[PDB]
Design a protein around this ligand. Structure first.
Ligand code: ADP
Ligand code: ADP
Lengths: 171, 340, 354, 354
């Protein structure tokens, strides 16, 4: 039905060497559940080098959920938004407003292309977003769309997540 | 099915006296040659399979596709479209790029559709007066054809520690899979495996994990990496399911590369099922795996020694620039992957 | 008149005649250009073509039958003993009799080939059909006579081609049955396997029953457990084991090589395969327990030999071990066993599959 | 006229008279060459093929019934008592009657064999058909005359073949009725096996109902648990259990051995099997509750004896325990139980399977 936007919300489940855990709810598919685990592992690794002092993603227990509870969801396209949600919760810093991102993320951190760019782009404008983040391998897909579906959108094409981190957290 | 009606056609006894329902008088079909064709060998008639001599017709790698298109497909498609060589010119380089990025199937019909589309678009420009003569360049091919299907062949140009290139078999040709490992946590170690891995390939990861852990004991006893740390292993193709034990040696290399913090050779692809002791076992689909290595632009390819016949059963140009290495035990692979 | 004459020699049962007699009256009252007239003509042609009371002259001499069996195949003593016992039983009875036998073993061992040798030793007529993954029950008993373009069952079609009521029927892959949903042909086999139900067999196209007794039935399989329990009940399990390396050479030297040479149009004066080169083929280019793969390799060698002599490369091809790699390429299998010296914790075992 | 004398011998019901009379006038006003002619004559033929009011002369002599049952089978007192009670009730009634009986027990015990003996004892025609692995309902009932290639149900074919209204219909493998994804065929069996609905059994092809009462329905099964509850509730369960080793010897001595000799064609003075050989064959070569596997061994011994006689090795063959291996080979089940002495922690138990 013309695509739709989703949110990835995380919160702390619980307030010596015991590690944290990630629980994912929502009618996620097997591929999406695996994507969360890959994103969780990369988010732990990314926070180590960016801020060794922070210990939020290692010891604390995090609950991840997609608010459309009754709607089944699948696909690895939510890899980057899961990483950003985990990092945003760990740092206590909200992401830049009116920002929508998509793309499969490997545990190394490279962003992989995703399908349905036309539907995601249309849904981005319908929500009135300002900036959209897409994988660099999807650059041809974005520019292949019609002219009237592109204006008013500041698109950022990335190949590694470290570029998304700067965009989502300008500072 | 009227397979019985076809038996008399292929039965020598009934060929001499062909009892036609329409024609009472028989005709002599003994002095008649018959040829048969088929697509897939699973639904073929097994009761009738014994009569016919099974001959396999393999596909074509991109080298024959360029030659077939240059000699047969393009001249024929141009003739049907009514164009001329002086009006529409398809160079060799653009045809290679068209084959590389749009038609990777083992067949030829899809390539015919693409070249006709380019000629059909070129015919429109000539008739409409857009250009007196239409010429095709790699930058212009997107406009004439459309969406590239295969853009990037190497996910990593330089493999970081813990990442090892592998080879895979696909219906649309070969494919290069990477194996990535990372620390899940900063007692017993554990290995979480993600990706749509099958039961066979998930077991091979467990076998590879055991051998790689045991390999470090005899190599670097002071290294307690794989015994105490928690490792996450992932094959960066989330949607596409993966199976088969062909990545056993790749997993061992990835685990050892992460443990020692030493990246593998930057243009090395390896394949082979590993056993608990560390013996490399033969793997099928060598032809598809080796052509993908050439597409990925790797120089050295490591294969099991039992696959020597399969590798040398290939054309000269397919295995021209590859310095193949044949191994019986993983200890040979370790030296190749870590020359220092 | 012609169809009445063609029934004179046969020994037709009474229920056959009344069906034939009533259809003749229907054919008489019809018209030449009638569609159903052709159907009546086609149906009546099949009834008369089927032999009634005609049994082929059997061979009931142990000496010549044993000699015939020995020349055709090597080994297979378990099968040969059963066939010799089959002939002796027929002598005491004084009349021909039929049995249901099963040959199960590794593929390519000789299960299908031995049955052809059995038919010639018994002077019977050989007919073969396969049931590997059956899906339609219409194969066994045909279609109903009312259907347009219908045909009788394959068993009924066998009597027409064999022209006798005492043929040898072969069934392939009874352990590869097809569990169909819309149609289950396993019931037809169970009726055929039952000796009591075998005597009176009925088909859709021919309403009249036909005596399928006194017919020697052979069925082949690989592993017996997959065969249904009602089917294993009525089968005499005769076991056909695999061959050792030295057994394969005797089969290849005496049977496989001369046969493949004949099918390629060559004689022993042109193409010669040495004993040692056959050993290298068995131990390196073959791993199956049967000789099906070895037969293909021998066929391929002769095909290349035929091309060489005609195309002027030579006049007589001798396949030495040195130049064998030209004909077949590199060895497919180079190691007989994965471990030659087992380290601690590694123990060699044995397996058994289809 | 031809259809008229076929119904002149029988006693036809009034409603069957209505259908045949209106259909007979239809044929006269119909066209011979039309496709409707084939449908009309085929249906009217089936009406004339039903034995309306025709009964076989039943055997009500209790003395002969005991003699026939005893001389063909051993033991099975529960089944023999039921048949004798069936005859005794029929004597008091003064007319024939029908029952729904089910024999359940281990395979190869005599369930099917005694069914043929009962029909001989009662002078009833014997018909057998199986429902094992059956999924289509139409075989029981039939199809409308509209459909091409539409045949009546099996029960209608039973009456045509037997030409009587009191057969002994044997339904085999009721416990293995195939589950129907589109429809369970056991639902149509209930109308067949319902005493209230047996008096008027209406099928799709035959518009008229048929009185299926006075028919002895016997069903064969191995385990009664799998049989559906509505089917099990309408049947009478009689247990035909296996035999002890002592009972097996009596069966083999009196029935199996003489029957196998006739099949092979050997006289008593030619081939002999002492009780010692049979006891060894039961104990060591056959691990079964029935006498099915024992029958195969007996045939094997006699078949090999016939070969020796023909070959001239021995003029007369006598089988003894010492030379039994020359006919059947080494023993199969050499151990009665795993542990002659049970170590601590090991306790002997008992199991019961199908
Ligand atoms: N003992 C033997 N003597 C002679 N020829 C044999 C022998 N065993 C096998 N063969 C040959 O090998 C082939 C075996 O194929 P076949 O028996 O039909 O396969 P399957 O065993 O699967 O039915 C036959 O064509 C036969 O000529
Ligand atoms: N009590 C008995 N007396 C004589 N013969 C028997 C007895 N029990 C079994 N048999 C013989 O053993 C064979 C067993 O087959 P049977 O049990 O009838 O098959 P099913 O189990 O399918 O009904 C029969 O052919 C029968 O002749």
């Amino acid at each position: 039905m013309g695509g739709s936007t989703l949110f990835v919300e995380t919160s702390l489940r619980r307030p010596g060497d015991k590690d944290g855990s990630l629980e994912v709810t929502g009618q996620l598919g097997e591929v999406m559940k695996e994507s969360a685990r890959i994103a969780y592992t990369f988010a732990r690794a990314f926070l180590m080098q960016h801020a060794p002092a922070n210990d939020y993603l290692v010891t604390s227990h995090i609950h991840l959920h997609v608010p459309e509870g009754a709607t089944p969801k699948d696909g690895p396209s939510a890899g980057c938004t899961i990483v950003t949600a985990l990092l945003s919760l760990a740092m206590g810093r909200p992401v830049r407003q009116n920002l929508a991102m998509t793309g499969e993320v490997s545990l190394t951190g490279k962003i992989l292309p995703v399908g349905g760019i036309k539907e995601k782009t249309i849904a981005a404008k319908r929500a009135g977003v300002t900036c959209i983040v897409l994988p660099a391998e999807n650059k041809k897909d974005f520019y292949d769309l019609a002219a009237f579906i592109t204006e008013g959108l500041e698109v950022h094409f990335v190949e590694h997540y470290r570029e998304i981190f700067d965009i989502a957290f300008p500072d | 099915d009227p397979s019985s009606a076809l038996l008399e056609l292929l039965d020598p006894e009934q060929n001499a006296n062909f009892l036609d329902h329409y024609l009472d008088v028989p005709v002599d079909l003994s002095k008649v040659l018959f040829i048969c064709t088929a697509n897939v060998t699973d639904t073929i008639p097994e009761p009738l399979r014994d009569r016919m001599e099974m001959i396999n017709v393999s596909g074509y790698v991109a080298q024959e596709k360029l030659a077939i298109a240059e000699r047969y497909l393009v001249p024929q498609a141009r003739a049907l479209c009514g164009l001329d060589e002086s009006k529409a010119k398809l160079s060799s380089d653009v045809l290679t790029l068209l084959i590389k990025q749009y038609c990777r199937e083992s067949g030829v019909r899809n390539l015919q559709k693409q070249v006709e589309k380019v000629l059909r678009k070129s015919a429109y420009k000539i008739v409409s007066g857009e250009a007196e003569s239409v010429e095709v360049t790699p930058e212009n091919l997107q406009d004439f054809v459309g969406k590239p299907v295969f853009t990037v062949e190497r996910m990593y140009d330089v493999t970081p520690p813990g990442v090892v290139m592998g080879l895979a078999w696909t219906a649309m040709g070969g494919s290069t899979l990477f194996v990535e490992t990372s620390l899940r946590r900063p007692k017993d170690g554990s290995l979480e495996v993600t990706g749509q891995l099958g039961e066979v390939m998930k077991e091979s990861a467990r076998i590879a994990y055991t051998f790689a852990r045991a390999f470090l004991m005899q190599h670097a006893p002071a290294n307690d990496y794989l015994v105490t740390s928690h490792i996450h292993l992932h094959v960066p193709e989330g949607a596409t399911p993966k199976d088969g034990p062909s990545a056993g040696c790749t997993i061992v290399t990835a685990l050892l590369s992460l443990a020692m913090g030493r990246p593998v050779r930057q243009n090395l692809a390896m394949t082979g099922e590993v056993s608990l002791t560390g013996k490399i076992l033969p793997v099928g689909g060598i032809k598809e795996k080796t052509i993908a290595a050439k597409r990925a632009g790797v120089t050295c390819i490591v294969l099991p020694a039992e696959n020597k016949k399969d590798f040398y059963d290939l054309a000269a140009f397919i295995t021209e620039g590859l310095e193949v290495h044949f191994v019986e035990h993983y200890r040979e692979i370790f030296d190749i992957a870590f020359p220092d | 008149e012609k169809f009445r004459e063609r029934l004179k020699e046969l020994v037709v049962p009474k229920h056959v005649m009344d069906v034939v007699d009533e259809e003749l009256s229907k054919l008489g009252l019809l018209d030449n250009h009638s569609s159903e007239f052709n159907v009546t003509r086609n149906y009546l042609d099949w009834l008369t073509s089927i032999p009634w009371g005609k049994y082929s002259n059997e061979n009931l001499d142990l000496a010549r039958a044993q000699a015939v069996l020995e020349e055709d195949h090597y080994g297979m003593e378990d099968v040969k003993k059963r066939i010799l016992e089959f002939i002796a039983v027929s002598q005491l009875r004084g009349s021909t009799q039929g049995k249901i036998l099963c040959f199960y073993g590794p593929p390519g061992v000789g299960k299908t080939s031995i049955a052809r040798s059995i038919a010639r030793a018994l002077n019977r007529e050989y007919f073969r059909f396969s049931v590997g993954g059956m899906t339609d029950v219409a194969e066994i008993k045909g279609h109903r006579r009312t259907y347009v373009g219908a045909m009788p069952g394959k068993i009924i079609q066998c009597l027409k081609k064999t022209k006798t009521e005492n043929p040898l029927i072969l069934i392939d892959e009874v352990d590869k049955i097809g569990r169909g949903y819309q149609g289950d042909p396993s019931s037809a086999l169970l009726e055929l396997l039952d000796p009591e139900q075998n005597a009176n067999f009925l088909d859709h196209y021919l309403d009249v029953p036909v005596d399928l007794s006194k017919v020697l039935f052979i069925c082949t399989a690989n592993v017996t457990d997959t065969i249904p329990e009602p089917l294993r009940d009525r089968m005499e399990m005769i076991n056909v084991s695999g061959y050792v390396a030295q057994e394969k050479l005797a089969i290849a030297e005496r049977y496989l090589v001369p046969q493949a040479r004949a099918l390629c149009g060559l004689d022993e004066s042109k193409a010669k395969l040495s004993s040692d080169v056959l050993t290298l083929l068995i131990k390196q280019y073959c791993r199956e327990s049967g000789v099906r793969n070895l037969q293909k390799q021998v066929e391929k060698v002769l095909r290349k030999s035929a091309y060489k002599i005609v195309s002027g490369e030579a006049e007589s091809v001798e396949v030495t071990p040195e130049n064998l790699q030209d004909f077949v390429g590199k060895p497919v299998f180079t190691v007989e066993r994965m471990y030659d010296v087992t380290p601690p914790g590694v123990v060699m075992g044995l397996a058994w599959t289809a």
